[PDB]
Structures are given as C-alpha cells and as structure tokens.
C-alpha cells in the first residue's frame, strides 16, 4: 500500500517537525533567560565596582611587559 506508506512518511515527518519546533522553543527561552542574565549587570565600593562592572583577569598570561604590580593592586588598591 503505497498510499498508507506515504501517509506514515508524512506522519514521521510531522512527528519530527513538532519535536524540532519544541526544541527550538526550548533553547530559545533558554537564550531568553541567558540574555536577561546578559541584561542584569552595570553597563571599598569603588573596588566593588571595579570588580562588578568590568573585573580584570589576573591570569598567568601577563607575558607582555612583566607587569607585577597587578599582584599588589588586587590587594592594595583594586578590588580591595
């Protein structure tokens, strides 16, 4: 029965499309709340802000010019 087989092919296609749309909606609302997180942010209290708004990254990638003082400012001034 070619007709019923085509019907079942369309059925499988629709059953696949509905789960596709469902998963698109799911990841979409996931990205919505993730963007709300991307929208929940600003742009001692001065140190609280140098941490909050744009916090630097004290990594081991300081190979540029041997900048050490970042070691101190993190505890002397910045984020202190």
């Amino acid at each position: 029965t070619e007709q019923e087989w085509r019907e079942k092919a369309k059925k499988d296609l629709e059953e696949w499309n509905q789960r596709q749309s469902e998963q698109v909606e799911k990841n979409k609302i996931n990205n919505r709340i993730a963007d709300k997180a991307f929208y929940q942010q600003p742009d001692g209290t001065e140190w609280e802000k140098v941490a909050q708004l744009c916090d630097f990254n004290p990594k081991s990638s300081k190979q540029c010019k041997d900048v050490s003082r970042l070691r101190s400012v993190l505890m002397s001034l910045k984020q202190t």
């Binding site: 029965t1 070619e2 087989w5 085509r6 092919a9 499988d12 296609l13 696949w16 596709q20 698109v24 990841n27 979409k28 990205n31 993730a34 963007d35 991307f38 942010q41 600003p42 742009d43 001065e46 802000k49 140098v50 708004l53 744009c54 916090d55 630097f56 990254n57 540029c64 010019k65 041997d66 900048v67 050490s68 003082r69 970042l70 400012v73 001034l77 910045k78």
Partner: protein, 257 residues
C-alpha cells in the same frame, strides 16, 4: 539474479518490495545511482530504515548528490547520523549543511567546535547570521571569525557596539595590535565606563607609551586607574634604569682590558 533482485524489490511497490534484502548485492554494483534509487524508494515508504543503508553505504558513496537529495527531501535532520559519519571530510557541502543545522538549531557551542574542526566555508555570511542570532555568544563568534578571517578592528568594534560589559575589553585583549587602542580607549573614556580603564588599557598594554596617558589624565584631570598605571610606568621604568645602570657598570669595567 542481482539485477533480478533489485528489480523484484523495486518493480512492485504495490506488493513485492523489501527494505533490508538490498544490503548485500551492493558490493559488486558498479554504478552509485542504484543506491540512490534504493535510498529514495526507502524515503518514499520507510524513511526510518535509512540508517542501516547509511551504515552500510559508507565506503562507496558520492556524498555530494547524497546530501543534495537529503536537502531536497529536507530530511537533513533525519540523515543527521550520516552527517555525523561524513562530516570528518571537511567538505563545502557537508560543512554548510551542518552550519545550517546549527543556525536553525540555534546552537553555538557544538557550532563553535565544528567550525574549529572544519573550515571549508567563508566568514562573511557566517558573521551575518551570527551577529543577528539573538545571543551575545552568537555575534561573539561572528566577531571571532573576523580574526578567523584575519580582519580585526571590526570584531572588537562590534564589542564596542554592544558587548561593552567587559566584553569590549574581552576582544580588546585579542586585538593585540597598536594604533587603535589609543582612540578606541579614549572614546571608551568619553563614556564613564573608565571605572575599570586600568584594565581596559592593560588588556592591550604591550605597546602603550605612557606620555599620551599622562596627557589624557591631565585632560580630564583624571588619576584613578591611572595612579596605578603610573606606578606601572615608574616601576617598569625603575627596573629599566636599574638594568641600565648595571649594564653600564659592566661596560665601563670591561673597557679597561
């Protein structure tokens, strides 16, 4: 009987057809379009039983027309396992198909890893899609492929557009090149995101000359996140003059001999 087998399988869609029986005689079939007819007739009746033929039709396959017809039937998400099988080839068609799978998929992480492993495509259109793909991460990868395309100053410029929340700095880091960060960072100072401008300048500190820094510090009469950078200036300069005095001592002492 092999030709007879494919006939008696395909000849009677009404009463005499069978999905599985075809997986054996394929070994001696010269042409490849016969397997295309097989998979097409399967899609016509039993699209769920394709995966088998996909597993078996792996070595001898003209994947070009395969993925073409899969796009025609638009069972690309159904032929997806075959796509996982053949994507290791880094071919234009398979790469673009997976990229569309990611676009409609709204996926970026696996999309990231894929466009890292495979590259047989352009950056322009991909940037177009990702920049408008609803996620700071999507447009972030749109920008990433700019250096992926080896054209900077537009990516970090896009960070300047929207991703300002330390992400502007996030790509100021990778910008890694001079004669931009001066004016970009000054414009950055125009708005009072300077709060962390010590980092905003350090993220590309390699080739900064502090003289303009002192100038602009004077221009706004601004010292915060510069007083630290001032300590930087003098301490690097401290070390510099120190090693200089050292080397000089060495030279003048060795001059005697």
């Amino acid at each position: 009987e092999y030709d007879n087998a494919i006939i008696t399988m395909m000849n009677h869609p009404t009463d005499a057809w069978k999905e599985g029986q075809f997986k054996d005689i394929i070994t001696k079939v010269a042409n490849v379009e016969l397997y295309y007819r097989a998979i097409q007739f399967y899609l016509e009746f039993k699209p769920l039983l394709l995966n088998d033929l996909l597993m078996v039709l792996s070595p001898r396959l003209d994947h070009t027309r395969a993925v073409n017809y899969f796009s025609k039937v638009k069972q690309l998400p159904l032929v997806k396992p075959y796509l996982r099988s053949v994507q290791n080839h880094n071919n234009k068609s398979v790469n673009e198909s997976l990229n569309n799978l990611f676009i409609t998929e709204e996926d970026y992480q696996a999309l990231r890893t894929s466009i890292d492993a495979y590259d047989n495509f352009d950056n322009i259109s991909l940037a177009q899609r990702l920049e408008k793909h609803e996620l700071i991460e999507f447009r972030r990868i749109a920008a990433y492929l700019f250096k992926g395309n080896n054209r900077w100053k537009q990516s970090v410029e896009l960070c300047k557009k929207d991703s300002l929340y330390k992400d502007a700095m996030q790509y100021a880091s990778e910008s890694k090149d001079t004669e931009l960060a001066e004016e970009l960072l000054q414009w950055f100072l125009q708005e009072e995101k300077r709060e962390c401008f010590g980092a905003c300048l350090f993220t590309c500190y390699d080739l900064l000359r502090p003289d303009v820094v002192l100038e602009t510090a004077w221009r706004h009469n601004i010292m915060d996140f510069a007083m630290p950078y001032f300590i930087q200036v003098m301490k690097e300069y401290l070390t510099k003059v120190d090693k200089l005095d050292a080397s000089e001592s060495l030279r003048k002492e060795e001059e005697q001999a």
